Amino acid sequence: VRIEITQGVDSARPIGVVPFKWMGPGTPPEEIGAIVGADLRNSGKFNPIDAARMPQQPSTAAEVTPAAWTALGIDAVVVGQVQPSADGSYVVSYQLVDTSGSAGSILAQNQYKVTKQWLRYSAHTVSDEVFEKLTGIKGAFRTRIAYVVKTNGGKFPHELRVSDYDGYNQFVVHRSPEPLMSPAWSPDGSKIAYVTFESGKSALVIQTLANGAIRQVASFPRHNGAPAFSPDGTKLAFALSKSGSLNLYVMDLASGQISQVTDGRSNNTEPSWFPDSQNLAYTSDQGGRPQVYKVNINGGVPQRITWEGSQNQNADVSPDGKFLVLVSSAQHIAKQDLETGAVQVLTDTLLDETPSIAPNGTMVIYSSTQGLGSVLQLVSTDGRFKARLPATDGQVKFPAWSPYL
């Protein structure tokens, strides 16, 4: 399993991630250093040096010789150790060491006790701490993605799947004879809402990941759905056409009470929340072709956001609420800065669909057509970095990036 980088950033910050020292006999159950290096490269903000070109492989700050690293243009080295415990757990230790002085200086350090299943998790935790210390931006390496796969054969061709952001640890959430679409994460990462065609008439359900339990929210015609959980965890937004056209509704999760949020004769769908859990961006066809609008759930006249381009839809509001990532259309992923109206087309892939922003706002996952198939694509929100997720055994659509985990 590997994230294929199709456009690297050659000016990314050089860093040294030393292979962690294994403190036991034989070989370690995971290579923590390799994962940390892969993570930092996947962020688009670092260029980890090849181990073969390292001047030494220190495992603690006292062993670091700063001159050897600065001479190679590297001002930070990640070092570490993995120690097996008697009970079969491991202690994963790391130190982030500044090499800009005469002796190493520690910028961050930590230790983690985990069993085998969470060694990759511990490596992502290292990556997160290093990333935030060096960039000031919170790391998203511990996150998951959800997506839908249509396999070419079998009784249950449609599967809602989850994996780590980097493609490892794939599991199946739900399988179905009939299409599945539009998964949406609860902000605590414990549930996913999605739309299903299984029962006949289409339905919106919420599935609890821990035990597979499924709650029915609503059933409706084919074009309804498009769920989105509010960031504060209290509400689920979605689109129903029972008024005579698609309109936005929110359900109070606690009471199950559903209230109508837009009341236009036009079709209004694809809600996405602003950080305040009070405002929604959404797609409306009131002007003819789809454009993106904003409305407050507590009342007020909707306001059009996207005034540039013939068509704009499937908007995702950034975690900080300052920009949209959306589909502009022939159809590409684009960023729009809300304060300035500045629009940046981010991709040149074919038939780009359904972008989802990582919880630190630095990266976008979306799907596109590559040849005869739909595949998952990554692009940085500044457009400099591009990659492709490892292929799956079938057509893949509707990616949704998890919250922080």
Q: Residue with structure tokens 């990266």? A: 363
CB atoms within 10 A of CB 288: 9
Distant-in-sequence, close-in-space partners of 230: CB < 8 Å, separation ≥ 6: 187, 236, 237, 250, 273, 277
How far apart are the C-alpha atoms of 396 and 381, rounded to whole Å?
Answer: 22
Pairing of strands 225-229, 235-240: antiparallel
* 5: its two tokens: 């980088």
Other CB atoms within a 10 A radius of the CB of residue 332 amount to 18
Stretch (H or E) spanning 131: helix 119-135
Contact call for residues 186 and 233 (beta carbons, < 8 A): yes
For residues 178 and 198, the answer to whether their CB atoms sit within 8 Å is: yes
Cβ-count burial of 391 within 10 angstroms (0-12 exposed, 13-18 middle, 19+ buried)?
middle
**Residue 299 to residue 114: CA distance in whole angstroms:** 49
Assess contact for 322 and 303: CB atoms under 8 A. no
SS3 content of the chain, % helix, strand, coil (to 5): 10, 45, 45
How far apart (Å, rounded) are the C-alpha atoms in residues 96 and 76? 7
Token reading at 113? 């006790």
Can you list the pairs that 203-207 forms with residues at least 24 positions away whose Cβ atoms lie under 8 Å? 204/238, 206/236, 207/160, 207/173, 207/174
Looking at CATH, the fold of the domain delimited by 1-142 is given as Rossmann fold (3.40.50)
Using CA atoms, how far residue 247 sits from 237, 239, 241, 265, 307, in Å, is 10, 5, 6, 8, 21
Instruction: Assess contact for 317 and 272: CB atoms under 8 A.
Output: yes
Of the candidates 252, 159, 145, the residue with the CA atom closest to the CA atom of residue 198:
159
Q: Considering the chain, tell me which residue range(s) the CATH 2.120.10.30 domain(s) occupy.
A: 143-405
Dihedral-angle region of residue 314 (phi above 0 means left; psi in -120 to 50 means alpha; beta otherwise): left
Sequence-ordered list of residues with C-beta below 8 angstroms from that of 51, at least 6 positions apart, any chain: 18, 19, 57
Q: Quick one: 386 exposed, middle or buried, by C-beta within 10 A (0-12, 13-18, 19+)? A: buried
Cα–Cα distance, 22 to 59 (Å, whole number):
10
CATH architecture of the domain with range 143-405: 6 Propeller (2.120)
CA distances from 28 to 77, 115, 235 (A): 21, 12, 45
- Which method was used? X-ray
Rg (CA), the chain: 23
Cβ 153 vs Cβ 175: under 8 Å: no
φ and ψ at 104, to 5 degrees? -55, 145
- Strand extents, DSSP E, 151-296: 158-164, 171-176, 180-185, 191-196, 202-208, 214-220, 225-229, 235-240, 247-252, 258-260, 268-273, 279-284, 291-296
Pairwise CA distance, residues 134 & 348, whole Å: 31
Cβ contact 262:248 at 8 Å: yes
258, 217 in Cβ contact below 8 A? no
Residue with tokens 């994230």: 3
C-alpha to C-alpha distances, 215 to 59, 182, 191, 239, nearest whole angstrom: 49, 16, 10, 17
Answer yes or no: are the C-beta atoms of 267 and 287 closer than 8 Å.
no
With beta carbons less than 8 A apart as the criterion, state whether 148 and 161 touch: yes
Give the neighbor-by-neighbor strand order of the sheet with 332-337: 312-317, 323-328, 332-337, 343-345
> Rounded to an integer, what distance in angstroms lies between the CA atom of residue 130 and that of residue 128?
6
- Resolution, angstroms, 1 dp: 1.7
Q: Where in the chain is the domain with CATH 3.40.50.10070?
A: 1-142
